[PDB]
Amino acid sequence: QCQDVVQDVPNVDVQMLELYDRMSFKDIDGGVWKQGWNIKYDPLKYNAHHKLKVFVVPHSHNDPGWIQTFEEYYQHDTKHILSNALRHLHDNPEMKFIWAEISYFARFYHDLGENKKLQMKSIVKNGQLEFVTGGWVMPDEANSHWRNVLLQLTEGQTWLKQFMNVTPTASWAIDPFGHSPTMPYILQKSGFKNMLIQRTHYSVKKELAQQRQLEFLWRQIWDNKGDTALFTHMMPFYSYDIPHTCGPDPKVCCQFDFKRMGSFGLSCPWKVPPRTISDQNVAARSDLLVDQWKKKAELYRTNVLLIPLGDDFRFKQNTEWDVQRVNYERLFEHINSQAHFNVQAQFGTLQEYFDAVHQAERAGQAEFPTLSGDFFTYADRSDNYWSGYYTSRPYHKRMDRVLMHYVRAAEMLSAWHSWDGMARIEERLEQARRELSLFQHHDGITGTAKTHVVVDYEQRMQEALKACQMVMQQSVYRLLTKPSIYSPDFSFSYFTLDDSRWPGSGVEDSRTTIILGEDILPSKHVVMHNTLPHWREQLVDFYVSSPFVSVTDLANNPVEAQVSPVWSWHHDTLTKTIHPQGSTTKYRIIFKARVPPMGLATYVLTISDSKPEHTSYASNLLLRKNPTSLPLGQYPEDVKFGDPREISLRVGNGPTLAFSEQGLLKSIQLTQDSPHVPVHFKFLKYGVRSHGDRSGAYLFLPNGPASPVELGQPVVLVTKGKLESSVSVGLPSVVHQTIMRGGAPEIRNLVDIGSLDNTEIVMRLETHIDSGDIFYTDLNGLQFIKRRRLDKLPLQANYYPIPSGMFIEDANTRLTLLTGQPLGGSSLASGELEIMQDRRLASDDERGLGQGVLDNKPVLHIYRLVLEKVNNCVRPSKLHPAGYLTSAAHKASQSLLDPLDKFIFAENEWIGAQGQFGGDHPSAREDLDVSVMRRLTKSSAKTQRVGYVLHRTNLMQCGTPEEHTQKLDVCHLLPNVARCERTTLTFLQNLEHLDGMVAPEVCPMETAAYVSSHSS
Ligand SMILES: CC(C)(C)c1ccc(C(=O)C[C@@H]2CC[C@@H](O)[C@@H]3[C@H](O)[C@H](O)CN23)cc1
Ligand SMILES: *[C@@H]1O[C@H](CO)[C@@H](O)[C@H](O)[C@H]1NC(C)=O
């Protein structure tokens, strides 16, 4: 059956949390290998019967945006690199080259004439040009959601299968800023056999090199058996450039980068240039080079050595191809003919290296260690920890999560039908997938690109959101209209989307008001979509032009509703206060929507002359000295005023929350009899150092612990309703809101750092939970990993990515904070959690960007805050490196990432309207998700195919009885199934033909893919 992911601590040779606890991290001068030691080798190790096999692997690192946009780099650099690679590889049969970024390759290939397309296919088929990874990009591993890592992998590999007839099984990741085990998890389930990484902490490189543990079988932290393991090669040195890839001494290796002699505008900072290889110098030059190679080889276990040969946007000019190739050819000819070296060297590809390593392994020449854990937080030198980019450009980090959900919902809603080509569904979805995939780049979501490049990514994502909206609204109109009435114009807007949290109140005025009136329109249809495979209830809200509005379902049953004002916050430059203003013509109506699994539900909003029977009205209380009136038009309850004071609120039977006179949470009481548990929100600021290294887009280099934000006497607004209550406060740089709907509260921060140079704003929670030095953070929204604060490392080293959540706990109590956007955070003291909101930095931090971060804009960050008793939960033992969410915390995360979608009918009358779609869909167990539903065939295919990715998380057992749910068989969701296959996660290879056309559910922590085939 399924592996137990909770109760069995895996036995591994290297466990990264344990390694961290033991290591001293001393930054000593190691000599020419500045962060290592003087490597020694026995010249007699290699001989006639045991030679060192060396593969020199030419490469070119091509960023899809960084200092220039994607299109700018394509025009100025990449198109020339690819054109000259085609010519030079065609003309020189022994030359080799690897390529990673399929976004660029697809852009190039589609512009080639047919003759050159054929030449290109031939150099791929014969093994000269080899694709590595084959993703659209080389993604960030810290901020990216696993769903989007899979999306971009699939986009690149699907293109490669169709046009190049290849599927890479070796991955190459030389530039992301630290590395996540989410990568081998996805890769191993997508047919991969090997992977390579580079950016790991210099102290980790030294420690693993000393033990020859730089090649390892990387398994997941919970995996007892080892079925998830993927062979991994970690590079040993400071960079992927030529000076740091031939061996330990960059002053020597730089002399073998033949682009650095002068005419290309490049030089060697160690002050010894390369020299052209000649018959008079080749013996001395070979002496030097082979010595570097044999030193590098000492760090690894086989007689097969990998020597990358490349750098950023290399291999651009014909003269560069010639200068590298001819000089290396002269070296190979000498070395391979001199028996005393006992070396055979040649150009190679990445797969050729790994194939030779495993041949050596099978011959019994080496065994490899097992490893679990991650490689965050990275430092490349001294105290320069790269935790800044966990937060940089937070507006676009939030946008990533919004678009993630819109892509999923658009692909799912449109998958139910086959569409005519005239509907442009495939076209719009391909655009949306490619723009989101592009943004996964390690200069996209990371917030590490130049200002105009960030603007390009934003514009691309906005076009993607519009594409998703078009596809979603056409799909809803088709799914909910009587078939013999349905009459689509594929360019028309039948519905508009309403989104309450993006761009958000105070960020953009983007939401449409539903206009009703006795002399214009009495009522309006709205529709909710639920992408999750279980029945779901959620409060939804709409703007309406009257407070006298009632809600009905499509059987005309009344639905209880609440009306509240529309409140907007203003920085009043006259009075120098931050305060709310209410609308006198627009109101919010709020009601509970109930929606089938993967389904739709229709409701109707109707105006009346006076207060409706089933609609209530919130009270409003403004707490401030020196109040002035706040008129609200037709709204039936007058606003009340008071001096600042402590207050308490409770919605339904849920928790009771207490707030300070500054409008910030101070305690949570779970039930009527229970204690008021101290839980305090506080805002603080970090600064920048006045001497030494400065914080920038990459680096977090604080000038000591954070200092409290001076709050003054802020204005607090309290709204109290039967369905929803809230407390909002206008603080310097942040409008902070706590919202209560009967369960764990929602927190929203409208963050505007303004002109506060050299400031990072942090949100901290203070509790009395006895967590000590332990906390938990997630990796890519997929898994929670145990962290240990280490006082032997600086503050910035204790910051980790918070891509979707974090928690602290003791024997009895847990506090979990879930996020709707990736940000950086930590627990710097027992009982605390903190998460960075935004950062504005005037200085460049010397990693090539050449600017600070001064382009901040208002962003609405969203969260859920879950306080729970955990004394009854079955948790992992003290030595287990993982943690797991409870049911309530998991559902709270889903409420942020995949909320209900809301659609407003755009015309006056919807002819043929229906009340529901998906009432007969199975309601699956709460830990199971249909992460992806995607139709894989166009309408002309006789046999239609639909792909599903199914993910089961693992939730803690805490004594809540399980109610029976229904089995979900994705292969029977569409009618007329003829075949069901288990596939790789990219859908590109069939792995299992399934009995009775039934797709089995997956085990906890597992992800599987299935494709159903249908007669059409
Ligand atoms: C010359 C100097 C300014 C001191 C410098 C230093 C370091 C780097 C990198 O680490 C390589 C960087 C790391 C950050 C990342 O944003 C960039 C781009 O992705 C590009 O591919 C090279 N990458 C580059 C330049
Ligand atoms: C694609 O690759 C396979 C495996 O090498 C080969 O059998 C097939 O003929 C190739 N398809 C082509 C060249 O169209």
Ligand SMILES: [Zn+2]
């Ligand atoms: Zn890069």
